Amino acid sequence: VQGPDFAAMLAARLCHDFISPASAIVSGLDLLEDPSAQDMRDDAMNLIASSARKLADLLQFTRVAFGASASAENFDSRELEKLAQGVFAHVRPTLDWQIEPQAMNKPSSRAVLNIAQIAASALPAGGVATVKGVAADGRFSIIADAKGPRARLRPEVLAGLKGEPLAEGLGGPWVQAAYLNALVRAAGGQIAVEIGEDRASIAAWVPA
Amino acid sequence: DVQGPDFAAMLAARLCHDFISPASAIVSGLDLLEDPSAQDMRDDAMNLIASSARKLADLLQFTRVAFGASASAENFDSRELEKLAQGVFAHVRPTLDWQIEPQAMNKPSSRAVLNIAQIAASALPAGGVATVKGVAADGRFSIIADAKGPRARLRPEVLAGLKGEPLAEGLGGPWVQAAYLNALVRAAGGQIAVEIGEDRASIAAWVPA
Numbered sequence: 230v231q232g233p234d235f236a237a238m239l240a241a242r243l244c245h246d247f248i249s250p251a252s253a254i255v256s257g258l259d260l261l262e263d264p265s266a267q268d269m270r271d272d273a274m275n276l277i278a279s280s281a282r283k284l285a286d287l288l289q290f291t292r293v294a295f296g297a298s299a300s301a302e303n304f305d306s307r308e309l310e311k312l313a314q315g316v317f318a319h320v321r322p323t324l325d326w327q328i329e330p331q332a333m334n335k336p337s338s339r340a341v342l343n344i345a346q347i348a349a350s351a352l353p354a355g356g357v358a359t360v361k362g363v364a365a366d367g368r369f370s371i372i373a374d375a376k377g378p379r380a381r382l383r384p385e386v387l388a389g390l391k392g393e394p395l396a397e398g399l400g401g402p403w404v405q406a407a408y409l410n411a412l413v414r415a416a417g418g419q420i421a422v423e424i425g426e427d428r429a430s431i432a433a434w435v436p437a
Numbered sequence: 438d439v440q441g442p443d444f445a446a447m448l449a450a451r452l453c454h455d456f457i458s459p460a461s462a463i464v465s466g467l468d469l470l471e472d473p474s475a476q477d478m479r480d481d482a483m484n485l486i487a488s489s490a491r492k493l494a495d496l497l498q499f500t501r502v503a504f505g506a507s508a509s510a511e512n513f514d515s516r517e518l519e520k521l522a523q524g525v526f527a528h529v530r531p532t533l534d535w536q537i538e539p540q541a542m543n544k545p546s547s548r549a550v551l552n553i554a555q556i557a558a559s560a561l562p563a564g565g566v567a568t569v570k571g572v573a574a575d576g577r578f579s580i581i582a583d584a585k586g587p588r589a590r591l592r593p594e595v596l597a598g599l600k601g602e603p604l605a606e607g608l609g610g611p612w613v614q615a616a617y618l619n620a621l622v623r624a625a626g627g628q629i630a631v632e633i634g635e636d637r638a639s640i641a642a643w644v645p646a
């Protein structure tokens with residue numbers, strides 16, 4: 230019998246992302262109660278508030294990017310931009326959301342959120358993730374261009390985007406890429422990648 | 438037609454649902470502190486944040502081992518597993534009676550015992566006691582969680598999940614954990630057994646050890 234290896238890997242990734250702002254809330258509350266750290270009262274309160282914001286943003290994004298079913302549902306592209314903006318708020322790269330306000334089907338919506346976060350993670354020293362999406366020729370086509378110093382799609386991300394098993398690398402970046410590949414291919418669509426100097430692009434289309 | 442990540446999405450939906458409850462309470466608590474109209478409830482809002490942060494920390498530490506662990510060989514201290522399971526029971530009406538003698542437990546036993554203990558807590562809608570037993574014998578590690586309390590019940594989606602059956606009547610949340618447990622126990626070469634009585638429900642599992 231096949232184990233829940235893939236679901237465990239996704240669970241491990243989500244825990245890892247949530248534990249960082251959650252433990253900071255615990256540590257911030259520790260500092261408020263500590264009589265020795267009464268000089269950092271304002272800094273501890275700002276740590277709790279920023280970690281609560283980060284955690285709320287990550288959970289709201291996860292809800293649609295990973296928690297959504299494959300059942301038919303339309304999403305507002307403006308609401309999806311809010312979710313992507315939320316995760317980009319706590320990382321060094323900036324977001325250039327160029328999708329004109331419109332209704333997006335479920336595969337398009339799940340795909341655009343995962344593509345935007347993979348583009349952000351391709352930027353280790355900042356830069357810009359440009360997100361484009363057009364409804365044309367019976368498809369919804371997405372392209373996220375990550376431009377910045379040493380922009381790179383890691384080998385486990387490239388393996389995941391092709392639906393290949395995890396070889397060299399961490400499960401965390403691989404599992405999101407493999408999840409995106411499986412939902413796009415289940416919808417009858419395709420994933421494409423572009424790699425250049427200080428640039429990486431992730432493209433996907435789904436029927437629409 | 439290609440297979441979608443439907444099962445992984447269901448597990449992700451379940452984890453979000455569990456974490457969003459104490460996380461939104463932290464946001465609401467911080468909203469009350471900043472609200473000039475609610476300056477008379479500063480103490481109550483701070484207690485809401487602190488208790489929700491404790492609940493969230495406990496849920497995340499448990500999830501890390503119950504759902505996030507790989508199938509790779511690793512031993513866990515049963516005392517550390519007790520702390521994780523107790524953290525889950527701390528914020529619900531049922532109580533946990535952990536009767537596993539302090540010992541080393543392999544990856545399948547550890548993952549299984551944590552899921553069984555939480556399924557036992559959820560089988561108690563009006564409180565009671567979940568007794569968790571675990572013995573290393575005959576080349577096996579055998580776990581039994583007995584949930585005893587008023588109207589103790591294993592929901593149909595939990596019974597379907599524990600047998601490795603698809604989701605029929607019920608919610609994905611309780612089904613996905615039960616199906617996850619079934620898949621990790623059967624991958625390890627073990628078996629799951631259930632007992633249902635009046636105001637009692639038991640979940641048993643064995644894995645090779």
Ligand code: NA
Pocket residue numbers: 317318319320321322323324
């Ligand atoms: Na940013």
Ligand code: NA
Pocket residue numbers: 526527528529530531532533
């Ligand atoms: Na309790």
